Each structure stands twice: as C-alpha cells, then as structure tokens.
C-alpha cells in the first residue's frame, strides 16, 4: 500500500501547519513450495518419420490429480 | 546538497516533495451569505431528538462572515473556520468550487471537511488543459444511475482506468458535522501497483484545476410544510478543510518547483531536460528519444557531441535503430570543412597531413593540381600526388619526365 | 581558501587561531561591593610613607560599580574597569571565580591583571569535565606548606608533568596596583619541547572551566589596632584583567570552532573525521585507528572500499596486524552475493560469467544442476560444469551419454 504521512505542530491554543510526504509499504515475501521429483527412465523410441512414442517412470507412485 | 545528484555524482530519479496544492490558494464559488445577510439554523441530533440553533451570516463582520478564504486557510480542530453556501440552493441549483493550481500536479487525493451535513450528491472534476474543458475525477451520490448517470458501486476497470467512478460510500447524513470525503486518485485501479511504468495511471493523476460542484443536499422533507422559512433556512454547503494533496508533476526530472520571470509554477528541469513538466529535451541534447525517469533506470537526456564543429543537433530514428538503440544524434552543418555525425573529416582539392591527427584545425593541407599539368583537382590523400597526365614526375604535376619536352597542346603537355 | 587544503589539495595538520578564551564571558563571583554599598580605601605608597583615599562602591551607579563583567570587559590602558571584591574577607574566608567556556580549550597561559595588590595566597584550578570535579592547575603562595599542602619552589619533576606546582614568584605586595601574575601551563615542563609527540603534556593543557581562588590576602598587620572600621575597609581583592590563552582542542584536525544546532561550541572536524574535539571518526572511514594530527604526519582518517555494496564497514585489528599497519576496514553486510573485506566475489551453486568484470552485478550466472543427473550443487566457476554422474554429457547434467539409456534409480540415472 502507498501511505501518506503527515506532521503537525501543536501547542495549546491548537495544531500548526502540515508537512506531508508518501511512502509505498515494501511487499511481504512468499515462501515458494518445495518442488517435487522430475520424472525418471525418459527413453524415445521412434515409431515413424512423423512419430515417436515418450515413455517416463515416476518413483514417487507407490488417487492423486497429477 | 542537490537530490539529483548521487553520493559520486551520477544521475538519478527527482521528485518534488508532498504537498497540499489548495493550500492558501484562491477559490472560486458560485454562492456566499451575508450579501445580502441571512439567516442559517444548525442542526443538532442527541439520542432521538433534533435541536435547531439558528444564527446570523453577515459577509462585513469577520467573526460573522463565511468566505471562500476559509476553506484553503489553516485549519484548527480549536478554533474551526468554515466557507458557507446560500440558503436552500436544493437540486436543481448547485454550488460549485473551482481552484486553479496553474501548473500540472500528479493529484494522490481530493478531501473535504464539512462544517454541514455531508451532501445526497457531489462530484470531483479536473481539467488538463488551464480551464477550458472538463473530465470527471470522482461522483458521490445515493441514485449514482438517476443523477450522474454512471453504474451505482461500479468495479474499477483494467480496460478504463481513466474513468471517473461513481459510488454511494461517505454520502450518509451522519456525521451531521465533522463529515469527510476523500478521493483517492489511484484507489482500486488495477494496475496502480506498477504505476511508474503506466502511462495510463500517470495521465489519470494529472490535473492542472479541480472543480467540485454539490448538486443535492440531505433533507429530513420538512421544508414544504406549513412553515418553510425555518425549515428551508437549515439546509446549506458548508467546508472548514479542502485538501489537494499530490507531488508537482516533473516526469521525475526535478526536486522542486519555480516560479519563473513571467511569475508562472513551471519544473526546474534537471538530466539535461526542458520543458513546463519536463516533458521536452533541452537543445543539443536529442542523442536519445526523450524518456520519463523510473526508480531503477535515471532515464538522464543524453548530450550531442560534434567535437566543437557544429552547435545545433538533430535526432534520427533510423540511426538510433541501427545503432541498436544507443544512440542517433547527428550534428547539423558541420563546420571547419568536416563531415560524419562524428564530424571528422577531409574533402577533394584537398589531402590529409599525416604529422597531425584528424581532430586539429589544419588536419587538411590544399591540393594544388597543376591546371595544364594535372588531369583532375582531387588527389591522393595519404600522399599528396595529383592525377599526371603523360607520366609526369611532379608531385603537384608540375615538371615534365626525363627525356620529355614541355608541349603547346592541352592534352598533351610532355613529348618524348 | 580553506587551511586544511595543501597547495595541490592534500590533507595537512588544522590548527584553530590563539584566541583569549576568557573575553567577553560571563564569570561567576563570590562577592562583589554595592549590595548593601559600602566605604572602600585605596592604599597608596611613596617615599618611606603610605597614603589612603576612600570611595564608595555603589552598585546601581554605573560609575561606581564592579561587576564581574568588568573582568572580561576590554582592557584600556587610559580607563581601567576592575571588579572588587567584598571588604575584608581574608582567611579561612575566601573570593572565587568560576569561568565556563563550555569546551575543551589547550590553555597556553591564564593571566590576571590587579587594582588591588595580589594576593598573598591564590590558586589556579581547570575542569575536565564541565564543572563536576575540580583539579589544580598551578599555586601561589608566601607559604606553600602551610597553605597549599604542596613544596615551595618545586622543581618540575619528569615523572609527573600533570601535578599543579606551587611557588612564592608573583605574590609580592610590590607593585601595590597593576600588579601581574600569568600562568604557563608549558613552563619547566621537561617534555614541554615534543609537546605534539607527548599526550601526558596535551591532557595537562586541556580544561573545559578556569577556576580562580584568592585565600589569602596581604595586610599590614593594622586590622586588629584600636579603629578596625578605617583599616580593614582598605583590604580587598580587585583585577581588572583575566585572559585564558589557547586554542580550541580539536587535534589537529580542524581550524575553527562553530556553535551548533543546540547553540554549544564544536570543532568544525575536518580529514575525514567527526566529535566534540575531534577524537573519533566519521562513519565508513575505519580502515585506520584514530591518530592525532602531527606536523609532519597529517594523519587523516582513511576511507574504507566496498566497491559500492555496503552501506558499513567496521575496523579489525588483527587484519591492521597482518597487513603490516596500512589497513584494517572490512565491510560489513555485503549485498549483491559478493564476498570479502574488499567485497567481491561468487558463491556456490552459482558460476563466474567470464564476458563481464568481477565487480559488475551479473558477475555470477545461476548452475543449474540437474536435481537426478547431477551428484552436487556446486559447480565448476571458470567452466560452469555440474558434477555429472555415470558420465553424464550433459553442461548441467541433463543429457545420458553415448550408448546410455534413462533408468528409474535415483543412484544410476544412465544405464549403458
Ligand atoms: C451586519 O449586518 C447589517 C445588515 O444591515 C449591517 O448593517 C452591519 O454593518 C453588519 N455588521 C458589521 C459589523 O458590519
Ligand atoms: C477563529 O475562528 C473564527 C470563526 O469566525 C475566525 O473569525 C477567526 O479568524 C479564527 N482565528 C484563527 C486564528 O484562525
Ligand atoms: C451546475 O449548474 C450549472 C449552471 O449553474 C451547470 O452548467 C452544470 O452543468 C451543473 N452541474 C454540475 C455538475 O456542475
Ligand atoms: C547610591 O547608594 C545609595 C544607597 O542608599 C542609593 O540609594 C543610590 O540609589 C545609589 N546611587 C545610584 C545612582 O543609584
Ligand atoms: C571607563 O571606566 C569607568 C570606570 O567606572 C566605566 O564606568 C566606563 O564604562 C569605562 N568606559 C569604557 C568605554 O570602557
Ligand atoms: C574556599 O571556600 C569554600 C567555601 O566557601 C571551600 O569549599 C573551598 O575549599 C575554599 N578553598 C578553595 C581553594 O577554594
Ligand atoms: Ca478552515
Ligand atoms: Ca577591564
């Protein structure tokens, strides 16, 4: 947020004449989620001029919307 | 001392301090009591009933009188001076304030501190130019749709930032006295976050007069019975404070603003800038297109150099795009017989001395080609030798070769 | 203009002008005559007989009265302006002034000028702090002993420099008016010579208050007679002079006092330096420990280098100690992932960019090892190869070798 101060003087009989400046609050940090295992045993296997088939492993599988 | 210059003197951001632009500044409304004087009647409420003071407003007694002054005068919680509209000026008729700041201001807020209960309608207009047309700033109303025609409690935009919005929020009766409303230019809008590097937001803030006009005031509906007298005297527009707070508007080219020979607010100009906001590049300067200044990047006018040839520079788009966006400041009619946006340079008839460098004045010895011997008038310019015709050994082509006889024909002017 | 400043602009030693520290302050008295007015007499000595005038000492008159402020006043040869004293307050009894200059002041000398004949016991003391405890300066006496508890005509021992020393010199009743006694803070003081090289000496000319304390005056030995009135009116101490010589202590590092913000004296520190009499250091300037000002040495306080990335540096004497006393400043906090006492470096799991100087900001690239291929997170600085397992070809890990397949163990990522 972007904050506008201002100082005043003041005494008995009442307040004095205003200084202002602004300031802009510095952002709070977020802590980034842990990240997970990449996948492992990537191997291509080339079918086609025009298509390869991927196949991955995951060692974190022993449910989940991955 | 200087806050554009940095602890070793390089280039940086300037900003004018936060002020308060009303402040002790003239302004003119379209209604004042005392003229001729008349009475007002100040309503109080205390648990579920209202009480009613009425007093004077004569304009020629000070203790008595409520003029524009006392909206822009100091203000003081203990002794609180407020400016007071004519009687009953209801919807239809409306009170209006113009202030002229004479000068573009990047506006934060528009305040006000009312004496009277806050009004039913009220709308915050600026102007970009000195006064001549208007856009709307900010609208306060109960019935946004019936009486400023925009949607009632609207969301702000990303597509239209620099529209005025409409909403029924600090409109309420209550507080009766002390009531406060006050515009926040950049409130809600969403790209406000990255405000230096949007140029929308920064044309948004961007007023050079404010104008606030009240258009209906709160009423309790007892002023068409019976007695109208008292009932119509009780309702008025009065303000004690009126704050235009925001930093002189300078693309943040300068710390303070000046008022110069002719006595008019303009920026003064730093980073090699000209200009009322600084908006124009001060001459001999065009080197790089002109670039308001951000936190990270000074963004500094760069100077011309013609290497004391030339005093007027100009700007090519095309060289600053070939250049690959450095630099494209080409100086204009090079003087002491130079060429090149460097404006180095040798010309033909003529022939570079070797024994001093390109810079020097005499850094281009004449050329002087035999007419009758000498074929051409441009020569070699590392060397010095004219084009001979007939195998001349002259350097200038002047003497004819061994064995060959000065000629009475122009073509040929050695025979063998 | 400045002194400070060498013909080519190199720091030298800053000495502030000799000035009589005394002039024109306010001095604080025990007694003065006038309240209530009293019958003073003026002793007078010519031939073998003695001559007295009696006056009268009313303070409202201006012509009159002695104050206090007619010791600091100017001194005119042609009409002396003297203080006086209460009639008759002889020992125990004693006459006090207290002057504060409110700093601290090398006092080369503290001079008093007589109406009255000196005192046959007075005593010089200073103040280090600004008035709480009191140290004698110098004594003068008929009898040391007996009244100061201090040896007559002692000779000033090497040993201790900073002892007051009492003497019978300057107490004679002769002259009876106009009558000198100035002390040499510097006078028989062994060291006095390599006074610049002997801290011991420059402590001992260092007060921030002069305090001066007539014991006992001379008398003729009539006061106890028959009429007591007529001879005990005629003794009292009276001074027309008091200069306190010296300049300002600002260790040679500044060459003018200046009043502050709060309105106290200050050296106008100078050489990189900052404090009251200059015996500190600005902040940022610790890669030298504080010295005082010599005539061949100018001794400035150096300035530390964190190549623009830390706002603090702090002084470390083992570092002093193993450079061989030339420097001893490492910064603290260093940003922009630099390491150092000279602040720039690179840090692991990061990488040296060759194409850009260690001190420019993107001096370290990001190594972006593989999580499965790689075996660390450090890298090669020069290269920027991560430590590949089985072999890996991969700059960062990321590619099988030649022949090698992806496997599902976190232990062999590349089978052949
Ligand atoms: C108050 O109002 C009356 C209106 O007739 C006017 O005559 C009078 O001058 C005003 N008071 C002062 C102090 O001017
Ligand atoms: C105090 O308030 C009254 C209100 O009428 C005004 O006339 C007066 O000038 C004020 N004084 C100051 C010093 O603001
Ligand atoms: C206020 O009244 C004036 C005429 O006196 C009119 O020109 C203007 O449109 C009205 N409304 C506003 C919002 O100023
Ligand atoms: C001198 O002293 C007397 C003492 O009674 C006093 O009344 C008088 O005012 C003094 N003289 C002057 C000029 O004040
Ligand atoms: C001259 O001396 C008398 C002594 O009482 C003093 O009152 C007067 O102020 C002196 N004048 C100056 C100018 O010092
Ligand atoms: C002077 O008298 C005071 C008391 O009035 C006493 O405190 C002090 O010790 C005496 N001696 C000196 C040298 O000040
Ligand atoms: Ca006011
Ligand atoms: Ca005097």
Known sequence: ?66 | PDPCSDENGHPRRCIPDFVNAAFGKDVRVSSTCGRPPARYCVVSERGEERLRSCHLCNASDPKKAHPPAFLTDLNNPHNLTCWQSENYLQFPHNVTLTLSLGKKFEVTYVSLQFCSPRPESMAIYKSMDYGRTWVPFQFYSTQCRKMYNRPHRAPITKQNEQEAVCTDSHTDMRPLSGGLIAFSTLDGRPSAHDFDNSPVLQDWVTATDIRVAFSRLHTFGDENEDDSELARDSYFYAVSDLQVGGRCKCNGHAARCVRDRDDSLVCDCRHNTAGPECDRCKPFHYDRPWQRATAREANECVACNCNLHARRCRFNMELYKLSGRKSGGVCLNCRHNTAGRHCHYCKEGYYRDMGKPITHRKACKACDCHPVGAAGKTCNQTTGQCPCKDGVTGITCNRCAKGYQQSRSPIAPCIK
């Open chain 1, 1 to 66: 947020s972007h904050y506008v101060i201002t100082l005043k003087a003041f005494n008995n009989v009442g307040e004095g004449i205003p200084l202002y400046e602004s300031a802009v609050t510095r952002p709070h940090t977020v802590p980034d989620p842990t990240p997970m295992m990449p996948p492992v045993g990537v191997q291509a296997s080339i079918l086609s001029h025009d298509t390869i088939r991927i196949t991955w492993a995951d060692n974190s599988l022993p449910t989940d919307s991955r």
